[PDB]
Design an enzyme around this catalytic site. Structure first.
Site, PDB file in Angstrom:
ATOM      1  N   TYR A  57       0.510   5.774   6.280  1.00 36.66           N
ATOM      2  CA  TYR A  57      -1.142   5.665   6.415  1.00 36.66           C
ATOM      3  C   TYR A  57      -1.269   7.155   6.498  1.00 36.66           C
ATOM      4  O   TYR A  57      -0.920   8.093   6.860  1.00 36.66           O
ATOM      5  CB  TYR A  57      -1.241   5.248   7.877  1.00 36.66           C
ATOM      6  CG  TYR A  57      -2.788   5.573   8.332  1.00 36.66           C
ATOM      7  CD1 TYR A  57      -3.947   4.984   7.601  1.00 36.66           C
ATOM      8  CD2 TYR A  57      -3.021   6.367   9.460  1.00 36.66           C
ATOM      9  CE1 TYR A  57      -4.912   5.115   7.872  1.00 36.66           C
ATOM     10  CE2 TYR A  57      -4.338   6.436   9.759  1.00 36.66           C
ATOM     11  CZ  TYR A  57      -5.190   5.935   8.938  1.00 36.66           C
ATOM     12  OH  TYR A  57      -6.630   6.098   9.381  1.00 36.66           O
ATOM     13  N   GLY A  59      -8.579   4.523   7.943  1.00 38.12           N
ATOM     14  CA  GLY A  59      -9.316   3.720   8.743  1.00 38.12           C
ATOM     15  C   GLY A  59      -9.248   2.149   8.032  1.00 38.12           C
ATOM     16  O   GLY A  59      -8.278   1.570   7.568  1.00 38.12           O
TER      17      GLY A  59
END
EC number: 5.4.3.6
Lengths: 526, 526
Positions: free
Chosen positions: A53, A60
């Site tokens: 991530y 997001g």
């Protein structure tokens, strides 16, 4: 003599020194090692184009988008810029510093897999005096605010100088510094945290405790001025009867503050003076002596004590948070990259919200104490409104109370923000903390309290002159009185008060009264 | 098995089991003899007819009035009667009992200088199912509320009977008991404390802790039924990165709940699946796999933990208050009659206001979870609003989510009360705490949260048998899922929902799900 930001020992008080006093900050070589080393292990992982991530995936809601490592720099760069959307006023130099200081200490814990350069850079700004221009509003609980900071690390955004924002690039050239270039996950680790609310909240709680002390300081003076009883501050009723930490501290602080006073009286005296007034034949006897006093001058330990507890709980959480890897994802030697939500500032959001409430009540108490001395019916014999001359013709302090009274109401209109979450970003952020809003609320109530305490300090001093009981004041009382009289003279005839109150409010802000007590007495304040 | 009200060891749980489970209360002769020691010296002091608030003087602003001993009885009687101005609804049996206990435990401390028969009369009532009629409103933080409980002791006021009140005179003689007589300091000691907010708060905080446990319970079921990731709950992410007590406690509870699940997925595998889905190149790709689930499914440890920390602190202050001499004045041996303000429930006022805010954010999280599962886009595959058959024709849980969403908003309308002090009694009470109001506030949000979780439990169970993932469920989830069906069947087609909701909520309040785990599972939840 330099503050040590190792990500394990940092304290709230230390954050203030760095933020306010400008204390130098040093990142232990041991921390830099844990960083440089961890930066190597992590790099190898990302070097394989593995799903991570904010490093190889969208941000997001767009975490479904996979980004090739070929855009390592653009991914982190586009993030800082696109998220640099803070609005509103800019944070105060000290505030901005606390924020950065909190972030530096975050990544310094050695779990954000960042290069040492990042730690060194942040530290450089804090020492070289390069304050980033951080907009107060934007964070949902602290992307926006932290994004504006990170922007200054790459020579972008704005830097705060003389209250105004100046291009970061132009300032870097003036300092000779060469802007850094964000690397793998470097941009995300800088903005993804609770450093905004933690740094700001740190200053508040720190000053909040100073405000609590200064509240007890003035309360003691007022008590001696009206010649109140000391029974309500006996250790037996707290250290034993009500073992509430905060309550015990306040009581002890009051006992010491009023040590060596010829004004205060003890219960054994009131009952002695009362049993003698009942000299009347018998029955229902109406006496002018009060075996006790109104809550404002009796339940000080309980009220300010409860305020202290809240503050302690806040400092605790703030301490833990400061020395915590509020970030995501996190790296752990011999482990899969941690994918959680340590950026969530709920704990700090709840804490600051509690400080706001606690501080509001501190102001409620002070206001009612002011109303007391100004009320001929409750001043225990003082002229109405502390007017020294001719009443009516002169209003005395009558007009000086309204700003204090108006403030209690204003502070009461501030509602908790930690429960006001609003879903954003494709619902990806369905639950946020709004911690930065809580911290600012607490700061406002804190600030407001200074103005209220300002009226109380002036009133007290005035009361001392009116009653002419200065020679009866205790050692600490005399210091307090003089500390005020040095800033503002006694009120003889009615006169412009605005400036007088702002003057003392400023003093209280700089903990000037808590100071005069340390250097003028042997008193040690909790 | 009986619980002892000694005024030093009495705990929240003990209060719950006493007020709830109708547990028996024992006052160790030690405390009895202490009350005697006190009740012996004090009475002597009152004999000398020396000034003493409440004992030989007026109350509040009437302190200036001195009451000759010849009226010891009357004085204490008029106070309890005139101050019995409680209004609003009557507290529940458990609520009241929880309060009557708190008052007994206080007097047990041995500083209230009350006759031992007082502690014996109170300890009896609780053991003989005699509950007083306590009106919820009237306390400023808790004369009125406690004035009613004191009324029943003097054979006056009303007692709680099958929801309604009934003259205490009838019930007493209807049990073999005869009204008591209030001696010096007997009436003031019974009503001069924070038993209302402390007793009420005790139950709330106690029930709140279970809610957190039950919030985590269903949260685990959902995460599994949705095939979420475990990374977020890893130990390193907390005990190391962010060592927040509650955060650690929550992260440990979630692991034990989803322990050994077939529906859950490890990061390593998520990372390996995604990787395989990525085509070679130096570009950006779109995937259907989420390396990280939304906040409502990944930030549990942080949010729920923050709540835990708030409940922990609240339970702490309560445990102190429960075993504190929250009365006035106070009697010690070898010392003077301590005239203070330990009746000021500020410590609990803040505590409960903090609980209200914390539990509110807990509802926010739960609600967003119900939304996450009902939204086909955020459901992660689950059908629209969990519709078993054809959509459009059937709404499924669409109408169910409304009460939960509405409750989140209603909860946000409840503001802090500990800062809403209003002066009264000739300014004698210039600063109060409104603690009882704070406690009710938390009681409301707590009750409201049960309905929120009720919809979450039902929705969760439905998600299970909607995707046929029951066999994949872990030992704990199965237990949870089982508990739901035992009360409500799976939703086949649109049908009345009110009952199912109120049924699951009524169960949650009992802790049916918390127990189902400890038994059917063996899981020792924090």
């Amino acid at each position: 003599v330099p503050v040590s930001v190792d990500g394990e020992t940092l304290t709230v008080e230390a954050v203030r020194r760095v933020a306010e006093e400008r204390a130098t900050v040093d990142v232990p070589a041991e921390s830099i090692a844990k960083a440089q080393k961890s930066r190597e292990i992590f790099e190898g992982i990302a070097e394989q184009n593995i799903p991570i991530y904010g490093v190889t995936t969208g941000y997001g809601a767009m975490i479904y988008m996979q980004v090739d490592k070929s855009k390592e720099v653009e991914l982190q760069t586009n993030l800082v810029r696109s998220h640099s959307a803070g609005v509103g006023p800019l944070f105060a130099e000290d505030e901005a510093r606390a924020i950065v200081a909190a972030r530096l200490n975050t990544l310094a814990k050695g779990h954000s897999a960042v290069r040492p350069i990042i730690l060194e850079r942040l530290a450089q700004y804090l020492n070289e005096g390069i304050t980033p221009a951080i907009p107060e509003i934007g964070s949902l609980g602290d992307l926006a605010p932290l994004s504006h900071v990170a922007s200054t690390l790459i020579g972008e955004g704005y830097v705060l100088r003389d209250g105004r924002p100046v291009e970061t690039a132009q300032v870097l050239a003036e300092r000779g510094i060469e802007p850094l270039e964000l690397r793998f996950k470097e941009g995300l680790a800088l903005i993804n945290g609770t450093s905004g609310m933690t740094g700001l909240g740190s200053l508040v709680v720190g000053r909040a405790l100073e405000q609590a002390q200064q509240a007890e300081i003035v309360t003691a003076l007022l008590i001696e001025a009206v010649r109140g009883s000391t029974s309500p501050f006996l250790a037996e009723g707290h250290d034993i009867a009500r073992p509430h930490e905060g309550q015990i501290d306040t009581a002890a602080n009051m006992r010491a503050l009023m040590r060596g006073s010829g004004l205060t009286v003890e219960h054994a005296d009131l009952r002695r003076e009362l049993q003698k007034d009942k000299e009347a034949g018998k029955d229902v006897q109406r006496s002018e002596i009060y075996l006790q006093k109104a809550y404002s001058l009796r339940a000080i330990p309980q009220v300010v004590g409860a305020v202290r507890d809240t503050l302690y709980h806040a400092r605790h959480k703030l301490r833990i948070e400061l020395n915590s890897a509020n970030d995501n994802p996190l790296f752990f030697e011999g482990k899969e990259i941690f994918h959680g939500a340590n950026f969530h500032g709920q704990p700090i959001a709840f804490a600051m919200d509690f400080v706001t409430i606690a501080l509001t009540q501190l102001g409620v108490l002070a206001e009612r104490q002011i109303n007391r001395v100004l009320n001929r019916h409750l001043s225990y014999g003082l002229p109405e409104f502390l007017v020294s001359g001719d009443p009516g013709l002169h209003s005395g302090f009558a007009g000086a109370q309204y700003p204090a009274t108006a403030l209690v109401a204003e502070n009461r209109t501030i509602g908790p923000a930690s429960t006001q979450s609003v879903p954003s970003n494709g619902d990806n952020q369905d639950v946020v903390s709004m911690g930065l809003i809580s911290a600012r609320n607490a700061r406002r109530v804190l600030s407001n309290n200074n103005k209220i305490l300002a009226v109380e300090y002036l009133a007290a001093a005035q009361a001392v002159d009116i009653s002419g009981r200065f020679d009866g004041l205790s050692p600490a009382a005399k210091a307090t009185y003089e500390a005020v009289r040095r800033l503002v003279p006694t009120l003889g005839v009615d006169r412009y008060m605005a400036d007088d109150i702002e003057l003392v409010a400023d003093a209280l802000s700089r903990g000037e009264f808590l100071r005069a007590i340390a250097r003028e007495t042997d008193i040690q304040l909790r």
